[PDB]
């Protein structure tokens, strides 16, 4: 019986909890990728490690909004990364691109729900903190995927090495 | 077929992977506790949030050793926190004490395995980075549990509030 | 009924208490030596006074570990220095050498006990804080004893005076 | 056959040696108290640890006067703390108050002896370095004992905790 | 007849002397490699020259422990580098990887001997100063070997040149 | 088939390689002496350790000239120190004096060869970097040998100790 809860639909509360789990999952995927490239693509490793920290801040801010609006946080298992054993740095970038577009669709479904329930604070929260960061991340990974393919990856040995030094350096 | 792997038993590699999952689980438990105390015990929240960051560094360093020794990281689901809905800040401290002693026993089993396989580098790694941090953490949580009980928790309203301001401030 | 005690054998607890008393005794021996050389070897006095402070920190850290592991500190009488009335600064160095090698054997017995009880944290604690400091101290006192004998002590009047100014200055 | 000894009675020399042992004993009592309060009253611990260092400086200065006046230092066993297992921080303060008043009576007996032997330098030494420090220490411990009783110790759980934070912080 | 020697087996003393010669040999191998790459891979040259200085510090610290524990240093011929005339920078990295893993096995045999003779100070010395440095060095050379092969070495003319500028720059 | 080699006789190339081995041998002799005086003449130890570093720079610069002139470096075993077990610091100085004069004769034979082959660059290199350093080193060791004998070494216990503090301090 929250004395602070106001105009916060239970469907929105449940969907925020599902988004929290998805952000944590994305953090887990990036942590997997980071530690995977320990041998020869160590700037890929630090790119994905930074991506991993960002995803956990994404989850923590949704956990904070759940408390702010008077909801109840409900956590679930953080599934281990679906994609794994990437044969190259390019394949990891492709999976991250796929991941971020899946997360973007989740955020767009969240916004549509907030719109349907007439929750302008929740729509503003999604737009201010997550919608443009998603567009930027998808654009960045799209740039990386396309550039690496043009450079000659994944066949070329120098392509991923040089991309590691110059683009992710 | 690792060219760097040397004196690294597959039982040790598997046990390191299980320890990685346990450290991540401990990080998840502390993140749950941190966000739980958003109302009235906000220094409990920052204590547990700091504990959460420490557990993830614990996991990342074990992931780094897995690569260093020529092993293969194998990740599993991060189970959601077993304990939940703590009725007070003291109960969260009791569960963290229980958690850390369970983690300590895991680390002691790890060391016994490393001793049995005559892996002095792995024994040194466990002793240098994890065994004393565990003793310190168990001692700290033990101090917090005992102090809060003496102060009159969990019945006393002022006890947890003042402990929040003075001990965890 | 310690809630923090874990893998801490009562034999180890008792042996830590005996080591505490031995470290305090060593501090008492050095304090005796320091105040003994007030007349003509005042840099011997400050060497032994510094040695005395170090031994008390040795005891305080063992007292801290006793609490950390959930043991109970049990103090005993600090026996007055066995050796006394040293006829020269060299004889005091010989007794300190004898003392430190006796303390080293105690620490090696402590480690063997910790090894027998499979207490890797206690083995690490002894190795990290006390085993190399003991080797260094025995080497230093051995150097001082040998050097003073070569210089012509204890018969030579200038030998101990110059050693006081140059080696311990 | 001291060429520096002048107007220094052998009764005074023996009584200085007994005072040295008493100061060391007081240092041992405070060290015991300091390490005793490791759990919940850690500012009591640092108060008593500081008291312990002060008592050892008290002993070292009496050892220095013994040499200054041409006497011979004679050390004895440092008895382990009589009082122990204090049920609260207040009980430790009561024992320290009892201890300091016993030490004060010793210092007053010392002064009466110095007066009887017409040793104005020894009377000045006792008055300058020890008589007012004793009055201050007895007053301080008396204040702490009375304040803690008024606050509701030892029954009140908050009393000793808050006194630890505010008075001894 | 060392007055400082304590719990130091003659087998350990002899094995330390053999390790000293091996560390000096490793320093000689790296000095050979450094001066070998004077033409076109001058950052390989400075990588191996730095490796060479490190190996001599490795030897000097073992010589210091031999004195510390009361042993006697016995030096032998420093054999000229076995491997030589490396056809590429990659082949030099492969020989250094082979060398470091041979040195690691020597250090692990040393530790097993120290364990058998119950010398915890010598086990700590090996673990603290040499076991993790060996794991790091083997991992680094393993990374370099694998990366250079992927880049296209040794056939590719640009591969070793760019690796020289970016990885070893 | 060196495109840079010009006016560089193969006899000079071979003699440079022999000089390289001799400089490394001299470095090994000084390293032996340094670690030998760990007990009572620790400024002798640092004098010889500095001498040892200088000899290795002597060897590295000859290795660099071998590459500069288009020659091929050929390394041989670094023989363990001929002289050993010096009974005093003076005897170590006498052996170093003997060593440096043997090295000087080698450098003078090298110069005569360079003169016979009309290699003015090699004559300049020997004169600029090695001939005066040799005269200075022989003069210094000659001074040390003579001074220590006059002071009363090796019989006098104070002589080597004071020389250690004042001349080599
Ligand atoms: Ca908006
Ligand atoms: Ca270790
Ligand atoms: Ca250790
Ligand atoms: Ca006065
Ligand atoms: Ca150790
Ligand atoms: Ca010239
Ligand atoms: Cl939900
Ligand atoms: Cl995570
Ligand atoms: Cl596994
Ligand atoms: Cl996490
Ligand atoms: Cl006991
Ligand atoms: Cl003491
Ligand atoms: Cl007396
Ligand atoms: Cl004390
Ligand atoms: Cl040997
Ligand atoms: Cl070398
Ligand atoms: Cl040759
Ligand atoms: Cl060398
Ligand atoms: Fe991102
Ligand atoms: Fe996100
Ligand atoms: Fe922690
Ligand atoms: Fe942990
Ligand atoms: Fe010491
Ligand atoms: Fe000690
Ligand atoms: Fe006091
Ligand atoms: Fe006092
Ligand atoms: Fe190295
Ligand atoms: Fe090495
Ligand atoms: Fe020189
Ligand atoms: Fe030279
Ligand atoms: Mg699954
Ligand atoms: Mg915006
Ligand atoms: Mg489940
Ligand atoms: Mg061990
Ligand atoms: Mg440690
Ligand atoms: Mg007795
Ligand atoms: Mg150490
Ligand atoms: Mg008694
Ligand atoms: Mg006054
Ligand atoms: Mg050979
Ligand atoms: Mg280490
Ligand atoms: Mg030979
Ligand atoms: Mg000329
Ligand atoms: Mg010149």
From Swiss-Prot, chains A, B, C, D, E, F:
Entries under InterPro entries matching the protein: Ferritin (IPR001519), Ferritin-like (IPR012347), Ferritin-like_diiron (IPR009040), Ferritin-like_SF (IPR009078), Ferritin_CS (IPR014034), Ferritin_DPS_dom (IPR008331)
Pfam family, one: Ferritin
Domain Ferritin-like diiron: 6-152
Keywords carried by this UniProt record: Acetylation, Cytoplasm, Cytoplasmic vesicle, Iron, Iron storage, Lysosome, Metal-binding, Neurodegeneration, Oxidoreductase, Phosphoprotein
Any one GO cellular component localisation term in the record: nucleus
The keyword Acetylation is assigned to this record: yes
Binding, Fe cation 1: 23, 55, 58
Residues annotated for Fe cation 2 binding in this entry: 55, 100, 134
Site (Essential for association with cargo receptor NCOA4): 18
Protein family membership: Belongs to the ferritin family.
Summary of subunit composition and partner proteins: Oligomer of 24 subunits. There are two types of subunits: L (light) chain and H (heavy) chain. The major chain can be light or heavy, depending on the species and tissue type. In the human liver, the heavy chain is predominant. The functional molecule forms a roughly spherical shell with a diameter of 12 nm and contains a central cavity into which the insoluble mineral iron core is deposited. Interacts with NCOA4; NCOA4 promotes targeting of the iron-binding ferritin complex to autolysosomes following starvation or iron depletion.
Protein function: Stores iron in a soluble, non-toxic, readily available form. Important for iron homeostasis. Has ferroxidase activity. Iron is taken up in the ferrous form and deposited as ferric hydroxides after oxidation. Also plays a role in delivery of iron to cells. Mediates iron uptake in capsule cells of the developing kidney. Delivery to lysosomes is mediated by the cargo receptor NCOA4 for autophagic degradation and release of iron.
Name under which the protein is recorded: Ferritin heavy chain
């Amino acid at each position: 019986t929250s004395q602070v809860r106001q105009n916060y639909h239970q469907d929105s509360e449940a969907a925020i909890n599902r988004q929290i789990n998805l952000e944590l999952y994305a953090s887990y995927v990036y942590l997997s990728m980071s530690y995977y490239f320990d041998v020869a693509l160590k700037n890929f490793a630090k790119y994905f490690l930074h991506q991993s920290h960002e995803e956990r801040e994404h989850a923590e801010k949704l956990m904070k909004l759940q408390n702010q609006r008077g909801g109840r946080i409900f956590l679930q298992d953080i599934q281990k990364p679906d994609c794994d054993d990437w044969e190259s740095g390019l394949n990891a970038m492709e999976c991250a691109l796929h991941l971020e577009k899946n997360v973007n669709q989740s955020l767009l479904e969240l916004h549509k729900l907030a719109t349907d329930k007439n929750d302008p604070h929740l729509c503003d929260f999604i737009e201010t903190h997550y919608l443009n960061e998603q567009v930027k991340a998808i654009k960045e990974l799209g740039d990386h995927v396309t550039n690496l393919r043009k450079m000659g990856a994944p066949e070329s040995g120098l392509a991923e090495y040089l991309f590691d030094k110059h683009t992710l350096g």
